[PDB]
């Protein structure tokens, strides 16, 4: 018997459109009694509102997922999230907790960066955003152009920096012909630490 | 007994002045018989110059260590180095092997990249390396000014682009009147698919 606990992603806890989830997964339970009962706990009270699926035989035993949706304010206040798993016939139950990351938040900065000269030998060429001095480090950046989306990017992980905050890039490819003829690009950076959790930054020739 | 084989640092095999070293980690062997003797394997042929490391009683078990040194250009070929390990009253010796990623090594670019505009506000400010293109992801990233080494930089892992290639930034952070008053900074990588496995490609005002 072992049981994960998962947090939501940033982005279902920023947007209040979206659903936040916490999910219990318990794997290894022995194939004899596959019953298991789950109690959830947020900050202390019992909530009652967990959707748990329905038990499926590993290959190998059964694992169960339990799901709670979550109020977007109590995980960002920084309530515990506790999942009490019951098996019949299992010495104690399993106790797991989980809350977002402890410490000042705090607001992250946002530099877009056109190509270096010597990358215009190329037919790509890289718009660079950095986003740095952000904490916790939960973020969720995406580019886009005339409000559609943007593709050929990748965002490093977010690193630890000398000051305790967080920085990352991400690098967006796109050919030297869009760049060249004008053209905005623009990266957005989601974050608690930002006013209505969001920010854009252009950047054009 | 579980056995780890490490692999030598990328800036060992790249500077023909350093000494790179395939370490080969035993664990959880009982303390009934702590002897344990190495064999060694590159790329099938045995080697016998393998320093091994006298065995130290964990708080928990013994762990010992056996130290080869390998030569710059054996690994950089990919010779595959195999760690067999005999232990007294064991049912038969475990091995493992080690080698160099596999594919076709490929040239890293580098641009670097002034603050941007908004970011002059500060009295620190960011300097920025991008690195693309490279193949395997095996890579040294440093800064200097001056030929002295510099400090408050930090560098992301190597993260997968979309062409199978690696890429990576460097964020280096200098006041902004170090970098206000001309003065050049300087973006050193160390990669297999470089002429001598090292560019320099500079910075300033
Ligand atoms: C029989 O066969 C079974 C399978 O059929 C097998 O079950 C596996 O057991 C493994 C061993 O226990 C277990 O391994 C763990 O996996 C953890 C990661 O799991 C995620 O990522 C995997 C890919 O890497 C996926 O395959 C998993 O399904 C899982 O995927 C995540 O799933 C959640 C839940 O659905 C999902 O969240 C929700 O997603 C939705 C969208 O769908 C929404 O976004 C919701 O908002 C959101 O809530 C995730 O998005 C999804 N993510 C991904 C990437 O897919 C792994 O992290 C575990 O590592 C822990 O343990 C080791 C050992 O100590 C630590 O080194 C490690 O750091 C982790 O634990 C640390 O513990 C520390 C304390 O000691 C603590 O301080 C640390 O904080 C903590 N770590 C961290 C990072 O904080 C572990 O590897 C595997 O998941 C099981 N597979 C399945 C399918 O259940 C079983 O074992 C077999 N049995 C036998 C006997 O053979
Ligand atoms: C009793 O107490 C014992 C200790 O007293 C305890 O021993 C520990 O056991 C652990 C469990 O087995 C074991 O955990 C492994 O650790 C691996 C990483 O170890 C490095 O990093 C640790 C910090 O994170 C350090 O503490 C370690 O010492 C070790 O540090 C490295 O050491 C080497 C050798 O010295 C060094 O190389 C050399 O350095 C010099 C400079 O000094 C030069 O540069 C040389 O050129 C260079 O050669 C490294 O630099 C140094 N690095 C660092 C960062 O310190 C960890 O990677 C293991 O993970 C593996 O297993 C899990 C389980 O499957 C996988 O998830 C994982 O990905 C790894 O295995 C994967 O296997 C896959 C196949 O299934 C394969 O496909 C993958 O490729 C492979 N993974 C990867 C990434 O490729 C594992 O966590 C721990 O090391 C032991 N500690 C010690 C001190 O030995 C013992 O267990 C206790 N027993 C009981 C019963 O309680
Ligand atoms: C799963 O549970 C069953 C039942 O508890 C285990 O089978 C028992 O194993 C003990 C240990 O020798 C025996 O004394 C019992 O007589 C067994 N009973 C039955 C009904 O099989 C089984 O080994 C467990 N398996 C795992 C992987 O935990
Ligand atoms: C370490 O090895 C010793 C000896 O092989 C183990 O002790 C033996 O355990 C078996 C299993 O019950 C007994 O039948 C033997 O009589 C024991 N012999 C001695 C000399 O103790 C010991 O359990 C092993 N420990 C670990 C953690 O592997
Ligand atoms: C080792 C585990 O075996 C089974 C699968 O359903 C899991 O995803 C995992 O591969
Ligand atoms: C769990 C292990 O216990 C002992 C130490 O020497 C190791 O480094 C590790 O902490």
Redesign the interface.
């Known amino acids: 018997p072992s049981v994960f606990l998962f947090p939501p992603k940033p982005k279902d806890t920023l947007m209040i459109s979206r659903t936040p989830e916490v999910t219990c997964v318990v794997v290894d339970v022995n194939s004899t009694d596959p019953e298991v009962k789950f109690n959830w706990y947020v900050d202390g009270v019992e909530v009652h509102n967990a959707k748990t699926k329905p038990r499926e035989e590993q290959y190998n035993t059964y694992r169960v997922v339990s799901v709670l949706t979550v109020l977007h304010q109590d995980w960002l206040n920084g309530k515990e999230y506790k999942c009490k798993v019951s098996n019949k016939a299992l010495p104690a139950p399993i106790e797991k907790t989980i809350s977002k990351a402890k410490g000042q938040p705090r607001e992250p900065?946002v530099?877009?960066?056109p190509?270096?000269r010597?990358?215009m030998t190329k037919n790509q060429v890289?718009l660079?955003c950095?986003v740095?001095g952000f904490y916790p480090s939960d973020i969720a950046v995406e580019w886009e152009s005339n409000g559609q989306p943007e593709n050929?990017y990748?965002?490093?992980?977010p690193?630890?920096?000398?000051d305790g905050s967080f920085?990352?890039?991400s690098?967006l490819?796109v050919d030297k012909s869009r760049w060249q003829q004008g053209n905005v690009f623009s990266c957005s950076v989601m974050h608690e630490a930002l006013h209505n959790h969001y920010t854009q930054?252009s950047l054009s020739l």
Do not use: A, H, I, R
């Open positions: 900065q530099y877009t960066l190509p270096s010597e990358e890289s660079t950095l740095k050929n990748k965002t490093t992980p690193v630890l920096d000398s920085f990352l890039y690098k490819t930054k």
